[PDB]
Structure formats: structure tokens, C-alpha cells
Amino acid sequence: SGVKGFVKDSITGSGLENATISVAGINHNITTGRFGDFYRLLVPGTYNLTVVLTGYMPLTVTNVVVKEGPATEVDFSLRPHH
Amino acid sequence: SGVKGFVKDSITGSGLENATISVAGINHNITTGRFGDFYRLLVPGTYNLTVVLTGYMPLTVTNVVVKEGPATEVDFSLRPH
Numbered sequence: 001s002g003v004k005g006f007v008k009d010s011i012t013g014s015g016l017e018n019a020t021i022s023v024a025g026i027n028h029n030i031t032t033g034r035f036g037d038f039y040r041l042l043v044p045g046t047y048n049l050t051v052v053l054t055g056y057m058p059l060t061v062t063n064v065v066v067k068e069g070p071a072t073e074v075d076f077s078l079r080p081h082h
Numbered sequence: 083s084g085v086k087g088f089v090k091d092s093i094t095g096s097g098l099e100n101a102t103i104s105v106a107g108i109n110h111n112i113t114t115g116r117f118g119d120f121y122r123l124l125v126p127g128t129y130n131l132t133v134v135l136t137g138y139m140p141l142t143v144t145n146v147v148v149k150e151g152p153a154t155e156v157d158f159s160l161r162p163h
Contacts, residue, residue, distance in 0.1 A: 054117070
């Protein structure tokens, strides 16, 4: 279980590599892959996720809900500072 | 909640890459990007920061207060040895 999906540029729709995904209260980050893909493994619960990449506004999405069972599919669209 | 901002050179005003910010008591230090940017989540509280970069004088910033909500903005200026 956890949160799965893609981090993408909100302007182009391109998947963004090297974006850092943080979970509030948990000192363990992950980074997106070459297609913008990620899968953050978490036990079921509610979490606040922050996604950061140089050149983009930081994105915080609150109260994201991880269930028992399959990963919660969530994409994150990062806004360039531009 | 956390910290974000830039590390810059005190002479040029330009951003510094690969500076490290170490937060006392918190594992996993903070590294700056290409133009000096950094970001890290921290729970609300008060933190003591040390900023180092080989070839620069280290900087100590105490009593940095982190409140709920957006990251706390703070910049650091490093002087070249």
C-alpha cells in the first residue's frame, strides 16, 4: 500500500525525474524516476506529501489517504516558477 | 512546515550549489541545488542550523523557529575563506 503515480510539469505534462517526495513526520525521502514515476510504500493512514524540484514551486497535498490494499494512485502536477 | 530559501556567496550575491545545512538533532542533511535553493520539511519547533561548503567560512544560525504551514523562508550568506 502507499501512494503511487507520477510527478508532472503542469505546463507540459512531462513526467519529471529527480523530484523529491517527502511525507510529513517521516524522515525518509524518495525521488522520482525517469518517467516521473514513484511509489511511496506506507502503511494505511492519512499523510501530508510535499513534492519539490528545483525550478518548480513546492507542492504540498494534505490529508492524502492510504487504504489497506492497492496503492492510492495520485499524480502531482508541479508548477514551474516561470 | 519546514525551511526553504537560498544559500549565497556573501561577496557576489550569487547562489551556491552543494552547500549543506545540518539541523541539530535531525538526521539527513539538507543540500543546495544548482542556484543555491534548498527545502526541507521539519515539524514545528526551534532549530539550530550549521551551513558548510568547502572553501567557505561555516555559518551558524541558532534559534530558527518553524511554524505550521508553508516552509519558513530563510537565506544564508557564506563568506569565502
